[PDB]
């Protein structure tokens, strides 16, 4: 009873819900400011190929810790390089265990 309450009070989002706020922005933002572009004879659709979705971009004041940023960045570079999983598959752990 106290465990759940304390965990909910602290609840450090480790992996699962770091920034999970994925909602379609390619159609949501075209409601916000795209009409002025459309009624006029202006084509800037190429020029918006640089911007990224903002619903993914999370905007709120949180606390940044040295170690947990380090862990997040290492886990990001690891799954980027994709070397852990290939050697895990080549390790045939299920065959042995």
């Amino acid at each position: 009873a106290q465990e759940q309450e304390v965990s909910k009070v602290s609840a450090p989002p480790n992996q699962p819900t770091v920034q999970v706020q994925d909602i379609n922005e390619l159609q949501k933002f075209t409601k916000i400011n795209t009409l002025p572009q459309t009624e006029e004879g202006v084509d800037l659709s190429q020029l918006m190929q640089i911007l990224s979705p903002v619903e993914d971009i999370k905007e709120k004041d949180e606390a940044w810790e040295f170690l947990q940023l380090k862990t997040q960045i290492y886990e990001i570079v690891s799954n980027m390089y994709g070397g852990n999983e290939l050697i895990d598959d080549d390790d045939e752990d299920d065959e042995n265990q």
């Binding site: 465990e3 170690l67 050697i87 752990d93």
Partner: protein
């Protein structure tokens, strides 16, 4: 932990355009477990539990409809067969008689029968179908039939033999007595399928009704009908519920085609099997415990019956996890228990937990328990001889790792091909990534936050890890995979075992294969002399010293630890200590004249006779310090007097060893060999004057007849 299929029998006789089907509904199991029963459309099948074959041919034509339920009588003497022919038969059974099974008494309700149950004590039958429920007593042979408002689905008798519980698809659960009166009624909103009564237990001694409703919930009800408030939720709708003997486990089946195991509290442990179809009935094998019997009882047996027509048998084996650091041995008892045993007084200390423990690691006066998604640490009061355990800290963070270790102010977890360092608070601190799976890790002593360790990989390369370095140090390379590693007391050599049960000894100063041995199960180094190796094969344990032939013992067990004049042998899950004699090594060391190492070996708690022996040779070979130490370890006065006489006489006179050898010999009762020794080189006169003092002058004259006096 491991689940293994044993034998599967399939019934493919599907009959289209006929109400008889190939499904199996129930599987009755005997109390002893030597026989098993199953029911199929228009047939009853009899099986042997250990091996899958029909002891008796399938019986057909007895019941013109399907068979709904089969049950024993808790004594292996009766069957109850209820059929959709609106009739229930009871059959007498006995293995020895020529007719193994034969019908005994048949009765019939007004409508179809749906469920049946037996009385553990009085062996009464309660059969409930649509619109009716009936009670049968063997003595009176008069059935009592009563009407009801909707079809009862399941029945179950309490283990005390007093109460009875039934459920209805309309949501009504009723608890009655042996007189069939409305003791308690509870109304729900979902159909009722599975109920059971918790087995009696000296710890609990109270019986409650466990009922699984179809709204994804499991409920506990008291005798008066008041719910206990558990109402544990489930992902899938339960179908069948069975309690193991002594009320320790709970086998749950239903939707998702999975047969799972739980504790009586509700903690998930394992999943037995996934058939890919609904499992109608799963049963556990009861066990019989003798008065004061000793057994691990890790083996478990389950029988599953599915919808397609497969009756399968599975065996569950629990692995052994234990820790041994010093003066303590913490091993996992029956699941969700930890027992700490001391080898000296054989006293045990029990710690009871609700969830399954996965790893047990004990550091100096600290024990770590790895519960599912939970970490517990307990300290020890060192001043008191008896240990007192208090929970200093608790970790809520969920961590998954096949190997867990605790060091001073830190924790180490091995998962896949990675090693993670955890602070006591819980936050991750450091990570190490290796090529292959980390198989075995060994921890070595050191300063806090600076404890090193050894790591073996599936490839075989042996690495070293420091807490703060964050850079693995390649120790050596091995071609075969590594299973267990050990380090010497001085950290001079290293013993490593491969998958082929091959033991190899590598020197750290120079990487060379000094020793190779075949068919080795376990090995251990000494913690005091740094040189002795005790390695145990499947049947024989060998102790080897430096450049010495191995010592054979034919002792049954595996070697786990080696201490000064002590070897630890573990059999199954019990442990024992055995003493060793160091006389052979002492003699061999005396052979090559390395008295220092011989004295070091004899210091390991050897009998006083070997002490005086070694002191004698130390005095003979002109080593006065070791001789004094040996003659001082055991309280002796005359020998030490001769010793300072010898050391005072060494510097000046010739120091002939014949006289001192003869004096050593004559200090005991054996005199004749001393006389011979003095007669050997030339000491006749000193022998004469020595032997006069004890007043038997005749033999002194015998000696002086041959001895001369070269003086003047």
């Amino acid at each position: 932990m491991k689940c293994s299929e044993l034998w599967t029998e399939i019934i493919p006789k599907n009959d289209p355009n006929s109400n008889i089907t190939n499904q199996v509904w129930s599987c009755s199991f005997n109390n002893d477990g030597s026989i098993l029963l199953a029911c199929v459309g228009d047939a009853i099948l009899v099986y042997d539990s250990f091996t899958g074959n029909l002891v008796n041919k399938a019986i057909r034509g007895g019941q013109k409809e399907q068979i709904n339920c089969i049950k024993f009588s808790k004594d292996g003497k009766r069957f109850a067969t209820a059929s959709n022919d609106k009739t229930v038969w009871v059959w007498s059974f006995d293995v020895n008689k020529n007719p193994k099974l034969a019908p005994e008494v048949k009765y019939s309700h007004t409508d179809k029968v749906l469920c049946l149950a037996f009385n553990p004590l009085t062996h009464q039958i309660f059969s409930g179908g649509a619109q009716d429920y009936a009670l049968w007593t063997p003595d009176q042979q008069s059935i009592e039939k009563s009407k009801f408002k909707d079809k009862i689905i399941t029945c179950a008798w309490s283990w005390d033999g007093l109460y009875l519980g039934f459920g209805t698809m309309g949501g009504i659960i009723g608890i009655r007595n042996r007189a069939l009166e409305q003791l308690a009624e509870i109304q729900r909103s979902f159909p009722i399928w599975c109920m059971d009564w918790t087995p009696i237990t000296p710890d609990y001694q109270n019986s409650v009704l466990v009922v699984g409703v179809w709204e994804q919930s499991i409920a506990h009800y008291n005798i008066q009908g008041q719910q206990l408030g558990s109402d544990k939720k489930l992902t899938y709708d339960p179908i069948d519920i069975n309690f193991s003997t002594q009320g320790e486990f709970l086998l749950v089946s239903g939707t998702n085609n999975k047969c799972t195991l739980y504790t009586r509290e509700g903690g998930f442990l394992i999943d037995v099997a996934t058939k890919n179809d609904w499992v109608w009935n799963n049963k556990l094998k009861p066990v019989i415990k003798e008065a004061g019997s000793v057994a691990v009882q890790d083996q478990l047996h389950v029988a599953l019956t599915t919808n397609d027509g497969e009756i399968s048998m599975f065996k569950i084996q629990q692995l052994t996890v234990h820790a041994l650091e010093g003066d303590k041995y913490a091993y996992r008892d029956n699941l969700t228990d930890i027992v700490v045993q001391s080898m000296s007084s054989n006293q045990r200390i029990r710690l009871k937990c609700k969830e399954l423990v996965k790893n047990i690691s004990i550091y100096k006066d600290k024990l770590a328990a790895h519960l599912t998604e939970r970490i517990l640490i307990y300290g020890t009061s060192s001043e008191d001889s008896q240990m007192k355990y208090k929970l200093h800290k608790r970790i809520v963070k969920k961590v998954e790792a096949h190997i867990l270790e605790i060091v001073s102010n830190h924790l180490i977890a091995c998962v896949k091909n990675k090693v993670q360092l955890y602070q006591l608070s819980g936050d991750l601190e450091k990570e190490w990534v290796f090529d292959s799976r980390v198989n075995c890790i060994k921890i070595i002593g050191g300063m806090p936050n600076k404890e090193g360790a050894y790591v073996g990989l599936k490839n075989g390369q042996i690495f070293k890890i420091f807490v703060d370095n964050s850079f693995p140090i390649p120790i050596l390379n091995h071609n075969i995979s590594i299973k267990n590693i050990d380090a010497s007391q001085k950290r001079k050599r290293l013993a490593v075992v491969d998958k082929n049960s091959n033991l190899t000894v590598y020197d750290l100063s120079n990487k060379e294969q000094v020793f190779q041995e075949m068919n080795i199960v376990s090995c251990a180094f000494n913690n005091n002399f740094d040189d002795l190796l005790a390695f145990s094969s499947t049947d024989t344990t060998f102790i080897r010293c430096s450049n010495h032939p191995p010592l054979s013992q034919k002792i049954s067990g595996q070697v786990v630890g080696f201490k000064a004049n002590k070897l630890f042998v573990l059999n199954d899950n019990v442990m024992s200590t055995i003493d060793v004699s160091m006389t052979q090594t002492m003699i061999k060391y005396l052979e090559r004249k390395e008295f220092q190492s011989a004295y070091e070996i004899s210091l390991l708690g050897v009998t006083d006779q070997d002490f005086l022996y070694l002191g004698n040779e130390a005095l003979i070979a002109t080593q006065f310090a070791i001789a004094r130490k040996c003659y001082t370890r055991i309280k002796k006065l005359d020998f030490i007097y001769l010793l300072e006489k010898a050391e005072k006489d060494f510097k000046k006179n010739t120091f002939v060893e014949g006289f001192y050898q003869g004096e050593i010999y004559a200090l005991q009762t054996k005199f004749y060999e001393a006389e011979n020794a003095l007669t050997k080189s030339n000491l006749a006169s000193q022998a004469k004057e020595m032997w006069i003092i004890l007043k038997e002058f005749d033999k002194a004259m015998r000696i002086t007849d041959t001895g001369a006096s070269p003086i003047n």
